[PDB]
Amino acid sequence: SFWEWLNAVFNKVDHDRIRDVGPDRAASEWLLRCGAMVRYHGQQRWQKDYNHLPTGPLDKYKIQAIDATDSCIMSIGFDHMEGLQYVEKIRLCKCHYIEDGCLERLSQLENLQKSMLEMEIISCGNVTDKGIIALHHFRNLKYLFLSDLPGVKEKEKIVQAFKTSLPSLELKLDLK
Ligand SMILES: [Mg+2]
Numbered sequence: 001s002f003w004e005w006l007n008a009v010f011n012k013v014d015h016d017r018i019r020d021v022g023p024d025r026a027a028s029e030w031l032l033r034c035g036a037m038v039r040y041h042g043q044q045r046w047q048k049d050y051n052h053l054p055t056g057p058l059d060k061y062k063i064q065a066i067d068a069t070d071s072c073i074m075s076i077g078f079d080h081m082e083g084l085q086y087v088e089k090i091r092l093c094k095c096h097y098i099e100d101g102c103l104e105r106l107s108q109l110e111n112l113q114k115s116m117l118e119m120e121i122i123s124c125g126n127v128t129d130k131g132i133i134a135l136h137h138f139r140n141l142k143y144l145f146l147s148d149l150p151g152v153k154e155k156e157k158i159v160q161a162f163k164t165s166l167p168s169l170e171l172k173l174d175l176k
Contacts, residue, residue, distance in 0.1 A: 011077030022059035023083025036068035065089035100131030147174040
């Protein structure tokens with residue numbers, strides 16, 4: 001369908017673009033075109049309008065936090081995360097196209113395993129226990145907030161899993 005093609009091309013990585021402007025800028029463009037927001041290290045304010053992303057020096061701004069609320073990010077789109085070195089915080093909220101495979105993809109990026117401190121996954125209806133468990137590879141995670149994930153059916157097992165694999169994790173669960 002047209003709409004499927006459109007979502008795919010919103011997500012698809014342009015590796016020329018990564019070469020030209022660097023991973024953080026290329027990922028910022030992906031996220032904002034897909035309805036997400038980013039915040040750079042050293043800045044208080046968020047980037048929320050694509051057209052206002054900075055044009056100041058090449059590869060200077062580094063993503064610290066991502067807030068993808070009501071966003072069409074999915075699957076291959078997350079390949080834009082591969083070159084990012086400093087991402088500490090990700091919120092995925094009402095990301096209706098995200099699935100376990102998206103979380104798996106993220107969890108396998110060693111760059112994210114090194115940097116990630118906080119993750120929030122809220123009202124992403126496809127996510128299941130499988131996708132959540134994959135997040136144990138984020139070995140430095142300090143905060144994980146899960147909310148309104150009806151596909152997550154065994155929350156007590158999730159708690160016990162993380163209690164072993166990430167004993168210092170603050171795990172906040174608002175799950176039925
Ligand atoms: Mg949004």
